[PDB]
């Protein structure tokens, strides 16, 4: 089946991501970023307080249903 992940915005908006455990989280970052209308290099994704790479998967990070991912912004100096 699909694993329902959750994204918690810094404003309060909740985004539910319906993806599979074999499905790379890379598309997750891009999909959300596309909706924001910005470069993926401007934001940062964190899971369990650790930054996520473009080579990680839900089944690789031992993620479960309702797992929330944090989305921050990079410092512009």
């Amino acid at each position: 089946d699909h694993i329902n992940l959750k994204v918690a915005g810094q404003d309060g908006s909740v985004v539910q991501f319906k993806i599979k455990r074999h499905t790379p989280l890379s598309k997750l970052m891009k999909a959300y970023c596309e909706r924001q209308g910005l470069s993926m290099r401007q934001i940062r994704f964190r899971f369990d307080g650790q930054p996520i790479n473009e080579t990680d998967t839900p089944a690789q990070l031992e993620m479960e249903d309702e797992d929330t991912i944090d989305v921050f912004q990079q410092q512009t100096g």
């Binding site: 908006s13 909740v14 985004v15 991501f17 993806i19 598309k27 999909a31």
Partner: peptide
């Protein structure tokens, strides 16, 4: 409030 639903499919 605001709720967003995104579904991504991967093909291999």
């Amino acid at each position: 409030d605001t709720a967003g639903c995104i579904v991504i499919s991967d093909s291999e």
